[PDB]
Amino acid sequence: MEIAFLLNGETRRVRIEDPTQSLLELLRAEGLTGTKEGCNEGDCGACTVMIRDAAGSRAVNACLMMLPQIAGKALRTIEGIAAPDGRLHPVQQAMIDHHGSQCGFCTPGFIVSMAAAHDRDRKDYDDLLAGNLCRCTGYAPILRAAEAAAGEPPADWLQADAAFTLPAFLPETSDALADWYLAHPEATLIAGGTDVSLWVTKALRDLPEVAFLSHCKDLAQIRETPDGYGIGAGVTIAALRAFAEGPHPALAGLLRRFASEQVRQVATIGGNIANGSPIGDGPPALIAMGASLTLRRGQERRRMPLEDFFLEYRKQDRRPGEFVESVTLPKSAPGLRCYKLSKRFDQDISAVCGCLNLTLKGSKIETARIAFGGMAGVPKRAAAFEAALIGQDFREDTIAAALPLLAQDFTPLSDMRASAAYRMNAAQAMALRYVRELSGEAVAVLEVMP
Amino acid sequence: MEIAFLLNGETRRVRIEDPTQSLLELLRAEGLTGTKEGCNEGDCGACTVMIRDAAGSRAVNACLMMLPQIAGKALRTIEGIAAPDGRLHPVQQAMIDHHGSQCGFCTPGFIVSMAAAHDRDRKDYDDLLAGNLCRCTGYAPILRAAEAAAGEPPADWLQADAAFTLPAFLPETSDALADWYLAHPEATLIAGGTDVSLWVTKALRDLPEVAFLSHCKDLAQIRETPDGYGIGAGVTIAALRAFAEGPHPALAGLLRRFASEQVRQVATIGGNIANGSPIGDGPPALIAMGASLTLRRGQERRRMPLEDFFLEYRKQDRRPGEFVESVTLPKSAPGLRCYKLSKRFDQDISAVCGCLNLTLKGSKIETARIAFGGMAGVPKRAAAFEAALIGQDFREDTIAAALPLLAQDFTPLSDMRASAAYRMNAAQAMALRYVRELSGEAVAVLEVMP
Amino acid sequence: SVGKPLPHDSARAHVTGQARYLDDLPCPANTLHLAFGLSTEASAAITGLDLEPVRESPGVIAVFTAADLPHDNDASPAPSPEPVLATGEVHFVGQPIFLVAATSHRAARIAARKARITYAPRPAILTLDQALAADSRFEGGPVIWARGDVETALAGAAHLAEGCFEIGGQEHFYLEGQAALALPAEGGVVIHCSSQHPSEIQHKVAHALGLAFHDVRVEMRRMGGGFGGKESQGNHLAIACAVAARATGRPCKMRYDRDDDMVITGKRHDFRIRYRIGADASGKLLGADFVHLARCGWSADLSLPVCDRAMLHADGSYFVPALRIESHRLRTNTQSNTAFRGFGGPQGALGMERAIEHLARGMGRDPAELRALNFYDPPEKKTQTTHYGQEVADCVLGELVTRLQKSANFTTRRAEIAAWNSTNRTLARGIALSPVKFGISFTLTHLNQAGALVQIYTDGSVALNHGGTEMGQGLHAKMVQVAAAVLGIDPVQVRITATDTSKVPNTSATAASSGADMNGMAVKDACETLRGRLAGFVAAREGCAARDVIFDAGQVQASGKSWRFAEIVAAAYMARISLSATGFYATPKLSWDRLRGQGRPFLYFAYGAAITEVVIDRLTGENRILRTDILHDAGASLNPALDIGQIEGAYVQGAGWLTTEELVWDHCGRLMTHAPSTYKIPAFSDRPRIFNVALWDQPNREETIFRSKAVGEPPFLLGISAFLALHDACAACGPHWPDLQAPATPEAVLAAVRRAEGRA
Amino acid sequence: SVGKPLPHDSARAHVTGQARYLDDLPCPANTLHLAFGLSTEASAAITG
Amino acid sequence: SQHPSEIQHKVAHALGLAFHDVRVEMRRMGGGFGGKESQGNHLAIACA
Amino acid sequence: EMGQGLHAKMVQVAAAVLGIDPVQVRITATDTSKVPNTSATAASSGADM
Amino acid sequence: EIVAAAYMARISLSATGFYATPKLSWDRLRGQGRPFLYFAYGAAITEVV
Ligand SMILES: Cc1cc2nc3c(=O)[nH]c(=O)nc-3n(C[C@H](O)[C@H](O)[C@H](O)COP(=O)(O)OP(=O)(O)OC[C@H]3O[C@@H](n4cnc5c(N)ncnc54)[C@H](O)[C@@H]3O)c2cc1C
Ligand SMILES: Cc1cc2nc3c(=O)[nH]c(=O)nc-3n(C[C@H](O)[C@H](O)[C@H](O)COP(=O)(O)OP(=O)(O)OC[C@H]3O[C@@H](n4cnc5c(N)ncnc54)[C@H](O)[C@@H]3O)c2cc1C
Ligand SMILES: Nc1nc2c(c(=O)[nH]1)N[C@H]1C(S)=C(S)[C@@H](COP(=O)(O)O)O[C@H]1N2
Ligand SMILES: Nc1nc2c(c(=O)[nH]1)N[C@H]1C(S)=C(S)[C@@H](COP(=O)(O)O)O[C@H]1N2
Ligand code: MOS
Ligand code: MOS
Ligand code: FES
Ligand code: FES
Ligand code: FES
Ligand code: FES
Ligand SMILES: [Ca+2]
Known part of the structure; x- marks a missing residue:
């Protein structure tokens, strides 16, 4: 091939x-x-x-x-990154002038990220470079460098690549895929590859029977529907973030802290869901917003509510030959609010992910969608808590009184990220957070300006 | 393959x-x-x-x-050459002890030569090492080392290899060869390969259609015959030399200065003949001694006197698909005397090679076979000179008076090894040398002791 | 450790095939291999140059031309330039024109042959005669030095000889051929090469790449022979690998195939020598006028210092009241000649030995007494000088030759030979004595410097490094011994490291037999610094004086106690005493003026003498050396075994030069002898059958390292005795002057025999 | 020169990815690669 | 490594060689912070 | 050198002590065969010493 | 030009250098002495939420 x-x-x-x-x-x-x-x-x-x-x-x-x-x-x-005649890119010269390197070893990766950002004129540096660690410089001088090079005409030699192109299975259509998967149920389906490559590089595994979904344009679509938006499985987290900025800022804000820009650029929602990790950040959110999932096997096509896809830790409602084809989101959910708690803000795995959606009938609580990741072997709604909440008044104290039910909905683990006690206490804290936020109070450490 | x-x-x-x-x-x-x-x-x-x-x-x-x-x-x-456990071979240690190396570059080849000689207990050093050149040491310290190593038991670890094995064509019999060559008349036959490998290393040529004769044991035999000895084409110059030492010391003494021991061990007489070089040393000698040559094509078999095989410079009496199968020597020829003349005695090409064989009827000259290499486009008898010699008395003055007839027999060329005047003059001198030698006089520089 | 006969530092690695030479170094898989396309014209303008067939050849990656050279196109060791790729014209058959880099050495040679070049030929100058007629030369005109008045002296002379004679050049025939490897190293390059003069490679590569010298590093661990042939001819290969490596971004290697090696590189200069020499009635020389014609090739290379050195030795071993030399350095369209063991010495000296032989035959006197009468006076008012005015205060030739003559049984053996010849009509034996007096030190004075860098590690082992390059002469064992003697430890604790310009800078070529003389001093200078530090430290610690700390045999002794060198070294380390030191040395007393031909260009003179016996065949010229007896003065040798080893090898190489080695060019200037099958160096059996070599053991009067003398080049002139002996034999065949020429091949001996015989 | 705010000796090389670190050095084709087998026990005698 | 002389020392001992037969070169590290003052010893020993 | 700028500082000290421009000074790889018996670069003593 | 002339005049252009920090001395076991040449100082003010 x-x-x-x-x-x-x-x-x-x-x-x-x-x-x-x-x-x-x-x-x-x-x-x-x-x-x-x-x-x-x-x-x-x-x-x-x-x-x-x-x-x-x-x-x-x-x-x-x-x-x-x-x-x-x-x-x-x-x-x-440099021009064919040897001229340095504005980002390279800036790094030299502002001392953005010390040992040098993370310098390439920084330069490439920086060059990519420069090519599309993106300036959200904290988010664009989150995924480039430097142990030596403190980062400060690298920011000065980005700023300094932003006032420079983009490199022409880099844009000329635009004019281009104009064993393992590589489907072009969802149909071709469905067909083949159906015949090779046992195959290994690779989308972004961001969870699978760790099986080969770290677990030292070997995967025969492989298919890449990244070339199925039709699996990676965002379609406006009569009753919501249809999001293809192959849609990347970055792209899903861009779409959500409008109708679902909360989910958008969440996806901000989903891995790094580099991983977001290739990881897929379908993949985040098919991986089925209880610490996925996608699921909890989607469930709080009550989206739905669509599986597919040949020409057949089931369709349950997301939360129902997850049975037990490491086990999903997936059939031999069956694959995830999309998820569907409502056109709106102003009640959604997403909370991620980790040791570090950027590029970290959640100790706990809290997604909350409460609908109101003026002062009274009509519906309650409450989801958690990392509180159990599976992402799941907090039933007993949800329940006890209906009909009650939406004030801090009512919520304060229902917290204990959370200790019945879940019995969290302890591990290197966090102790059970802390996880528990945090799920409860997310609940206080929600009321306080909706009631217009200052709650977010990241929104504090110096 | x-x-x-x-x-x-x-x-x-x-x-x-x-x-x-x-x-x-x-x-x-x-x-x-x-x-x-x-x-x-x-x-x-x-x-x-x-x-x-x-x-x-x-x-x-x-x-x-x-x-x-x-x-x-x-x-x-x-x-x-060293033992598996790191013991140096006696010849190695001796080279250290006697300072047999300075730059080091000729060292390995001297050590391998010396090792092989030790293995069979051979002591004729000057001849065994003629073909290992050293520019640094002046050779004396290497003689000292060979001489000290000779008194040491052979390496056991070298002898143990004796126990071993007990596209491009590789015939095992003269028959298989004969067949195949008949079908590929244009093939390149390779025996010892000492003339052919220079077509590839120096002329940078490329030879397709190739056969190796070194594995036909039957092509490499010395057979006693009723009227002489039959020598296979694949018999090596070293082996021919060993055989001649008894019945044809004069041919043996000649082959002493043929190339080097290293080359002699793989070059073949058949090859020296087929190469057809007017400076070959074999042909003159065999012609003076009156040998015959046997060609062979399939099952057919010709048989002329050796001199008749060479027609013109670079051209032989050889038919498509026909090869050289052997040569036959008389059981005796005590009049033979072979002279080779070059710039250096060892491992040099002849400027002139003269082979003389006169038979006597007491004081009178009966038969005269006189052959020269290097005096012409092809090895040849000196007819006019031979003729004027018969019947005459065998004294120096009669030979002296016939010398000018050699200038009629040959018109020698000038080149980098010698000028025509010199080659002519030396052909003549060989004649004077012959009488003087047979007449019991001191004539050979190589037999003078200090 | 000095004075002991120890083996070469690498004897064990030589003998097991573990020592690496340049082409044995492991290199990365993407390493390119290169080869030059060569001129097929002795002299012509290049008119067209189609390299398309080259680029299309299999495995080729890049092809280069003078236009592609990014900066300097110059490999010359002298002020006048010598391109590496031909710039529009060519000046000899073999000048490199373009450069191919391919993925294998074969692919490169093969592509190298496929170019289509058109030329516009020009008349070529290939012989001395032509060059003289055309006034083709270097230094705009001859160089003449005169002492006294020769014409006057010759006119009034009882005896006189006039004669003329050719002397052929010689091919080095180092067993390992020219070779280099260049590795891009971020910004600069590293060059590994097989060269006697890595600082010059450094210089030349720098200029070719456009870099300061500090961005080019050159290492050289060992050469498979040099003999002078690598004093400068290393420059081309090195420049080509570096330029190729800057262009393709990858390591590049070049090694010559013997044929190319012989066609492209230089050789000992061949000479024509005209002389007139006269003497007293008693035998004392009165004067000698010499004219020297030297064929230098198409570019200056090292002709200047070579010719000067010939001039400096035109006196041979003899005091001459009046003497004149006119030296022409002629440019011809052939290989650019260069350094070779002896560096002009032998031509100059052979000049005088021939002359004095001629004179002797002329007066019917035995050559040996004539010579013995005219040697400089022994040492110990007014000391004799040379014709360039340097006092000769150390000549022991008198004492030496007498001692050689007797140990060698000369007189008796001369009689046995006469008798024997008188009974033989086909063979003749010959025997001759020839002396040597060879000055030591480069004649371009500032080259007489050397450095070293020594390190002591805390376990007591030592790493020694100096500017000289090892090519088989034993330089590295000698330096190890010096170091072990001065630091008071056993040699085994001292390890030599590769010559490296980033460790000792600005070195001179290893040559002029000055390698051990100067680096030994530098090494001693560095060890004494260290030893000074160590004594200082043991003294303060044990409260005594430093001069009373004693280093010997691996032990250190002071105030009645003693310790192992390693304990002292560890204690010095803990006391924070630096254990690293450089060393330097500049030879003193030298000063001279080339143009005037006056001064002291040498620190001292090496002497020796050889008696050689040969036999020849009056019918064909065939011949060989039966016996050689040598007594040579290597001062207090640093290593007699390595010294005897140099003397034997040089003897064989000099005799090689004047017997079987012959270079031949055809009418178009192509070299016809360009392979071992047609150029013949001495083979194993050409070794003398009886070969006696002894050393004259007397310390040098000058303060040289341990009072030794250089023994690398001087002894090559002892081969003259072999030629003188072949001449003795020819002379024994008739009453006429044999006029034997050099190289005395069998054809040449025969021609001489016949002149002697009067047969024309 | 002391006192001036001059860039790291290898700034340009860092920024163009020309600077070499240990694993970037060119090496012969026959170079081996090594890896350790590690203990899975905090404290123990090894028995087999 | 931050400490080539120790690497030299430890490799030499691992190999039974005097120090003068082991040379250590090191042109740059991508970061040390003290972590390469000594833990370089294992890799070097193993390669040697 | 591990990123802390040691080499640039020594380049500056040398160019200041010889009277010349830094660009004329080139740093070479740390090598136990050029400077022996060194200590670890550490204890913040790299540039002082 | 100065350097070229020094070269012609045969003056060595190579040199080693060495330095041992002075004034130091102390006893680990007793915990007394001068183990440092000098102290470095600084201060920071950090604000967090
Ligand atoms: C540095 C880093 C940071 C990360 N941070 C986060 C984070 O903060 N939050 C988080 O939730 N995750 C995180 N992850 C993991 C996250 O799941 C993946 O990055 C991603 O969402 C999976 O997308 P993908 O296409 O690459 O999955 P893939 O790696 O391609 O694999 C998906 C898994 O499901 C299967 N699969 C893929 N597509 C389908 C399909 N449509 N139908 C059925 N099965 C399918 C695959 O075979 C595999 O089993 C992080 C990973 C890394 C490398
Ligand atoms: C270093 C050196 C020194 C040498 N010295 C001498 C010397 O002193 N004197 C001298 O005379 N020669 C000398 N030679 C060459 C001499 O001919 C060869 O070295 C040798 O005799 C050829 O033998 P070969 O078996 O190697 O022939 P090959 O190289 O094997 O082949 C020679 C030619 O014969 C053809 N051929 C071989 N066998 C047959 C067959 N039986 N029938 C038909 N064609 C056949 C081959 O095709 C090729 O055409 C020297 C060579 C070298 C390298
Ligand atoms: N073994 C060997 N000896 C040799 C050479 C050589 O290449 N190999 N070169 C000669 C030449 S030309 C010189 S100039 C001296 C060098 O000796 P030196 O370093 O001790 O001065 O080596 C002489 N002896
Ligand atoms: N960029 C960078 N800076 C660094 C380090 C490093 O690994 N990278 N190591 C530190 C440590 S542990 C020391 S001890 C000092 C050493 O610096 P010095 O050589 O100037 O003493 O650099 C410090 N600064
Ligand atoms: O012959 Mo030595 O001067 S290279
Ligand atoms: O921690 Mo710095 O002492 S290596
Ligand atoms: S190696 Fe660290 S992100 Fe790829
Ligand atoms: S400079 Fe060392 S990691 Fe960024
Ligand atoms: S390389 Fe010279 S004989 Fe083979
Ligand atoms: S030792 Fe140098 S070639 Fe023989
Ligand atoms: Ca040469």
């Missing part, structure tokens, strides 16, 4: 024999030593590389990206 | 794709960097290696040796 892509301006055709090899290894094996390996798990950014295609250009972690994925795209690494 | 051989004690199986590759390159590419490349032409000895099969063990030049030639053999390089 042969693929093609542009590499740092040059056309490249490659014989894939192992479809699981990561982009990071192919590269270092070709001598493109400039992309570094700092963790090989998606957290450090040190392997960041820039891809481009019709949707445009973005920065992603080469260690999470297997080869097949870059077919038909343009790829830019740190060695190709 | 796959061949097997023992390498420094270990069995090795190799896939041959280029039959023409030399042993010296295969070894250096495998990382056995101890075998050196000093000329790539057979002259320096620096690539010397030791092979061993049922005839026993010998040192040869790896640069002249193609891989197919070692199939079924045991190969020892400098890295394998």
